[model samples]
Target: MALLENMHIEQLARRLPARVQGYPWRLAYSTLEHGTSLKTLYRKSASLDSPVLLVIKDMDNQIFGAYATHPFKFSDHYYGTGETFLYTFSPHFKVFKWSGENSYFINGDISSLELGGGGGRFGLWLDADLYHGRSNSCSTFNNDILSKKEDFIVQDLEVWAFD
Candidate 1:
């Protein structure tokens, strides 16, 4: 089966399980606050040949987030050349700046890191100027996309309480 056909946005959304992690300390210290709601989406491939796309939308069906990845193990190589490894799914990867304060970082360095080493090795560093002026936190979606295990997609995202 083609990876594209197997991609189902609805299934991805339904499978996502969300919870309130917490407001980041930096944001709190900076006077940024957020609403008491958080959501998370997890997606898993049914077959080895299937990949998936994460389409994020709001109540009005506006696209806010989009992500996709391969279903195999790959290594990230860094040569201590001061190089920064960024995920292709990075929300702000295409933008130089925005009207609001935004920050993000990958969980690990580029050199000698296994693709799926189980937790901490891969995650997202995200912060917004909307809440507490500036907020920071790390979210671990998943370390590996197992053949039949779920991947992740998030939508309806909001960070309230920023000036």
Candidate 2:
């Protein structure tokens, strides 16, 4: 079966840790800015290491994605390196550290990342894209098509971070 058709938010949520580091990941980060050119991923997500549930609403309104680990880097130099890795169904929700990746590179290298959201970053990255790389229209884990590809337009990108 296709990955999208089998995704379930509730299933992913159940595996999430109730806390991380020494703090409880009870806070939800949403909203990029003050609501103009709005983005749902909050800047606070960058301050803590948490699993992010990335949701996408395509122009045709298709919703599907997976639970991911890693605190998104809005402006970190260490981010986008090959030291990152993630999962689709979170099949590996076992004990893990803060190790994570959200770039669209198969190797998590920004230099080798894909602009259309495939095979790099493996998820999302604050890299160059028509929609500030924060738009659901920008990049995704599957990399089928992404950002503002015109033909593969993304309507909304809702990133729910537990921090």
Candidate 3:
């Protein structure tokens, strides 16, 4: 099926390179599309060179995302390289590699699988309320991510792969 086919979030990913029009940027994960949840993307993401673009939808329909040059990998303790960057659907895009100290997890006692996933090296993050209000320096605060804090709400989640 076409990427974002029959979806409401297609416009959010439009700013991506026009090359993807001919390339292999395809949908890798989604709720209605994949029958999966955000919590499972760590183990369910696509290939490495394919890259990944994680999209989030809030109640307002606003869109935000994180793009990683590498595929999502399950890990414990913080680790990885500068291969991920965060963005928004305001159309503003910046390429910032994972530049954080902790492994997206401040507590060493925490499970490694829950913290380190996503882009770059160690770019895993969740809603403060959802993941109990914790994140790496690379993660966005408030509801600006794939997951949201439990106090508020998250509308939807989608992941695209650029092969």
- TM-score to native of every candidate shown: 0.21, 0.42, 0.53
Write model 3 residue lDDT over 118-155, tens digit each, in one string.
34433334442222222243442112333233222345
> What global local distance difference test value does model 2 have?
0.36
What 10-residue stretch in candidate 3 is worst by lDDT? 105-114
Error of 3 at 116 (Å): 9.6
Error of 1 at 144 (Å): 24
Residue 26 lDDT in model 2?
47
Which digits, one per residue and each the tens of the lDDT, describe model 1 over residues 22-55? 3211111111122422111111121223222222
Name the best candidate (by lDDT).
3
- Candidate 2 Cα RMSD (Å): 8.7
Highest TM-score against the true fold, candidate: 3
Q: Cα miss at 63, model 3 (Å)?
A: 0.4
**Per-candidate local distance difference test:** 0.22, 0.36, 0.45
For candidate 1, report its TM-score.
Answer: 0.21
Ranking 1 against 3 by TM-score, winner: 3
Off by over 4 Å in 3: 1-22, 46-49, 90-124, 127-152
Error of 1 at 121 (Å): 12
Error of 2 at 74 (Å): 3.3
Better of 1 and 3 by lDDT: 3
